[PDB]
Each structure stands twice: as structure tokens, then as C-alpha cells.
């Protein structure tokens, strides 16, 4: 590695760390996902979300 090639030392294997920050002060503070149902069966529910007065009567 000589000359201007060393100047290109960022495009060679000097691979930056993927883990930007630790668990303390961020790092994994944006990896939280709400564990929903992900695919509900609205068949039994689309009678209680809109048809509420009929269920009350």
C-alpha cells in the first residue's frame, strides 16, 4: 500500500464497527418492537367495534 492508495484507506478493510453505541446510552434503544398479534382474525371482532348498540341491546 503506497502513495494515494493509503489515502483510500477508508475503502479497504478498515471496516467500521457496526455496534455504534453500547446498551447504556442508546445502542439498542431503537430495537424495541411491540409484540402484537401481527395478523388478527377480524371475523369475530367486526361485530363489536362498529355494532356496539346492537350488542348492548
Amino acid at each position: 500500500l503506497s502513495g494515494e492508495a493509503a489515502a483510500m484507506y477508508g475503502d479497504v478493510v478498515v471496516q467500521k464497527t457496526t455496534r455504534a453505541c453500547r446498551k447504556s446510552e442508546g445502542g439498542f434503544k431503537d430495537v424495541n418492537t411491540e409484540l402484537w398479534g401481527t395478523s388478527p382474525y377480524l371475523g369475530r371482532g367486526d361485530g363489536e367495534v362498529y355494532n356496539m348498540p346492537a350488542s348492548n341491546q
Binding site: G37, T38, S39, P40, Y41, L42, G43, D46
Partner: protein, 435 residues
């Protein structure tokens, strides 16, 4: 060196490398929607055991689904050699229902036939390892079996069933368990005292999609080209020891068909597609004094020796007109799968493809049985004159004859695999064509 090859360039290479279009040294991988696969246990409604019938509702614990495995825990009712794919035998059948409509259904025999034709090599061995005892396990041994389902969505991600697009329809699987399983709770016609009932669990592998794909699947209509199994069980003209039994079977099938498949069997013994004989592996105790040609060596029920197969010849006829020239049973047992599958098919199991590649997903040619007024399969059986207890007769015989024990192969199972369309829209779905 390699340079001596590069320099050897002539007019004849223009067809291969002139005006080149591709290289082999630059693979471009396609960026894909982010997703993840989670294996989730399903509940089972109803007790399981021999003769029980239960069902599951596929829980809404993902957006799309593919692979499904039914687990069983069985205990051996006898020693090694007494069972044959017992988890396959146990799962008598599985029915797929969407919105109350039947979409498809598989049978234990289908799983056996399917495997016999379409699985191969170590895929087949690993399969056997998940359905049977293959390391000489002994009586009382306990094992968990994993028998995968083979519905259209259980074979490729490409057909993942969009549960999320079926917001108003339930998706269910009904599982029928066999009344008896050889070497587990029964030994031929006798029950095995003290046999345990199976433990069962159904596992579904769910696909979790990222935000944009989830939205599209939930909101857009979809059309998935799917496979369906059709099955008709029937009487086999009982093979005769004095002549050649023959039979004309009404092929009461519909839809564009990828292929037909069939086997002849002895219903007493699961997987027995051939005659019993006193040659090693062909019967219980075969090869010695204690051999009987009334009971198979269950652990070696299957065989590749067509001398023990019953079918002499067959043809498919459509509307009174031959579909192809009559071919011998061995043509349907060995050539068809050579050409169309690339695996090896056990004796007694037959295939006739209408497709170039029936083992694949792409509909590479189909026969529309919904456009036939009178479809039929014509079979001719071998003369069953060979003394099954005498290896000289069993092994030294002719092309047109079989064992006298081949007359026990009285059941015929004809399967057909076709292509239909499963249309999903506005949260509901079902098949485009009834027949």
C-alpha cells in the same frame, strides 16, 4: 496454461462468446423485503390417540404461513423390524379448510405414495428418520416423529398462505389419526397389549413481514396458483393365479392435472404395494425356515423388485380414445419417474405425468380433466402363479407373472394432482373453480 485455451478462439465460438451478454464472475443478489420466520406451537382441539380425530385452527401469530410439521411421540409395540413409517401411518389424513370451504386434503397413503415418487436420496432418508425407527430401536423405545405437511403452501415460500389477507375467514386443519398403527398398537390383526397412545403437537412456521409488505398483503387482493390433491380409492380387479385380471376404472377427476399416480396395496399392511415372498426382506422371516408369506417384514415392507408388483400394463383413455400407447407396469414404475422426477420409485407404485417437471411448482404442462366427458384408466394384472415360498420361483420367473400372494393386493389408490386458483380478496377467499 489457461491462456492456451483463450487464444484458441475461432468462428465456432461466436455462438458462445461473441457479443457476450453475461458473465459468471459477477453475481448480483436481489435486495429483498425484510422478514423473519418463527416456529409456533398450535393448540389442538380434542384428545389425540388411536382412532381419534382432532383439529387445529391456525393461530394468527404471523402474517403469512408456510411449513407445517405434525409431531408425534410414539412408543414401539415390538422390536426393530415391526414398524414401517408409523408416524406416516398414524396421520391418516389432513384436511385444509378456509372460510368453511374445503381447499385440499392429504391421506397417509398419499404421504407414502408421494414420498415413494417425489422424495429422494437423503431427503427421503431424512424423511424416513422423522417418521420411523431406523437405528434398530427396541420395544418400548420412545421417539418424537416429525411428519411435514405437503399442501401447496407447505412446499414453497412462493405460496405462503396470506393469513393476514383472510381477515374474515378462519383457516383450519383437521387431522385424522389412524385406528391402528403397525408395530405401535397392532401387530398384523392382533392388538398389542399395553400399547401407549401417541402424544401430538402441531407446529406452524410463520412469516413476519415488515411494515410495507404487511400492509399490502392485508389490503390487496391476491391470486395464488395452487396445487390440490384429488383421490379416489377403489376395488382392484382381484388379481388371479390362473389368468390376467383386467380393469377399466372411471377417472373421476377434474381440473388441469399435473399428474396421476397410483398404487395397489394390501390394506392390512400399511405401505405394502407388492406381494410377499420368501426372499430376504420380502416377508416376515424371509429367507429362512420361519418365513411366512402371510406377513411382511414390516421394517422392509417396501421393495424395488417389480417381480412382486401386480400391474402388467396400463393405459389412460380419454373419451374412448387412447391418450397414449399401452405401456408395461415397469414403464410407469421406473421410466416415468426417471424422466419426470429423477428419483427412484418402489415397486408397486406408479406414475404418469402430463407435465415436463411434475416435481416442480411451475405448471409445465397439464391435462384438463374438467374438459373430459369420460376419463378412464385401463389396467391389466400379471398372472399370480408364482410360489411365493420358493425363491427359485420368486426370483427366476418371467416378465408377465407374479407371486400367488399378489392376489392380496386388492386395493387401488388413484391420485391426481391438479392446479386451481386460491383467490383472496377483501379479507375472504376460496377457490376459483369448484370442479
Amino acid at each position: 496454461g489457461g491462456l492456451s485455451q483463450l487464444v484458441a478462439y475461432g468462428a465456432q465460438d461466436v455462438y458462445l462468446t461473441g457479443n457476450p451478454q453475461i458473465t459468471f464472475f459477477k453475481t448480483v443478489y436481489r435486495r429483498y423485503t425484510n422478514f423473519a420466520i418463527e416456529s409456533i406451537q398450535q393448540t389442538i382441539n380434542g384428545s389425540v390417540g388411536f382412532g381419534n380425530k382432532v383439529s387445529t385452527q391456525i393461530s394468527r401469530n404471523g402474517d403469512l404461513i408456510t411449513d407445517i410439521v405434525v409431531e408425534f411421540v410414539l412408543t414401539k409395540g415390538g422390536n426393530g423390524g415391526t414398524t414401517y413409517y408409523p408416524a406416516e401411518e398414524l396421520l391418516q389424513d389432513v384436511e385444509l379448510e378456509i372460510g368453511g370451504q374445503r381447499i385440499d386434503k392429504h391421506y397417509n397413503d398419499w404421504f407414502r405414495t408421494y414420498d415413494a415418487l417425489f422424495r429422494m436420496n437423503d431427503d427421503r432418508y431424512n424423511y424416513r428418520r422423522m417418521t420411523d425407527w431406523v437405528n434398530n430401536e427396541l420395544v418400548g423405545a420412545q421417539k418424537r416423529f416429525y411428519v411435514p405437511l405437503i399442501f401447496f403452501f407447505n412446499q414453497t415460500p412462493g405460496l405462503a398462505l396470506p393469513l393476514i389477507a383472510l381477515q374474515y375467514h378462519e383457516v383450519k386443519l383437521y387431522f385424522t389419526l389412524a385406528s391402528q398403527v403397525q408395530g405401535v398398537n397392532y401387530n398384523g390383526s392382533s392388538a398389542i397389549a399395553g400399547a401407549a397412545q401417541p402424544t401430538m403437537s402441531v407446529w406452524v412456521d410463520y412469516i413476519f413481514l415488515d411494515t410495507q409488505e404487511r400492509t399490502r398483503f392485508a389490503q390487496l387482493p391476491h391470486e395464488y396458483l395452487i396445487e390440490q390433491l384429488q383421490f379416489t380409492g377403489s376395488e382392484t380387479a382381484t388379481p388371479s393365479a390362473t389368468t390376467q385380471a383386467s380393469q377399466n376404472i372411471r377417472l373421476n377427476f377434474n381440473h388441469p392435472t399435473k399428474y396421476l399416480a397410483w398404487n395397489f396395496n394390501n390394506p392390512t399392511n400399511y405401505g405394502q404395494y407388492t406381494a410377499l415372498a420368501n426372499i430376504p426382506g420380502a416377508c416376515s422371516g424371509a429367507g429362512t425356515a420361519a418365513a411366512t408369506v402371510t406377513t411382511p417384514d414390516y421394517g422392509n415392507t417396501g421393495t424395488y423388485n417389480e417381480q412382486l408388483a401386480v400391474l402388467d400394463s396400463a393405459k389412460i383413455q380419454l373419451n374412448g380414445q387412447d391418450r397414449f400407447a399401452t405401456r408395461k407396469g415397469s414403464y410407469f414404475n421406473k421410466v416415468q419417474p426417471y424422466q419426470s422426477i429423477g428419483g427412484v420409485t418402489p415397486a408397486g407404485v406408479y406414475l404418469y405425468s402430463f407435465a415436463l417437471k411434475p416435481a416442480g411448482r411451475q405448471p409445465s404442462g397439464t391435462c384438463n380433466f374438467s374438459r373430459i366427458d369420460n376419463a378412464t384408466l385401463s389396467l391389466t394384472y400379471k398372472t399370480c402363479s408364482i410360489d411365493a415360498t420358493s425363491p427359485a420361483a420368486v426370483l427366476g420367473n418371467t416378465e408377465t407373472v407374479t407371486a400367488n400372494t399378489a392376489t392380496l393386493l386388492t386395493a387401488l389408490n388413484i391420485y391426481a394432482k391438479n392446479y386451481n386458483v386460491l383467490r383472496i380478496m377483501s379479507g375472504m377467499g376460496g377457490l376459483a373453480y369448484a370442479n
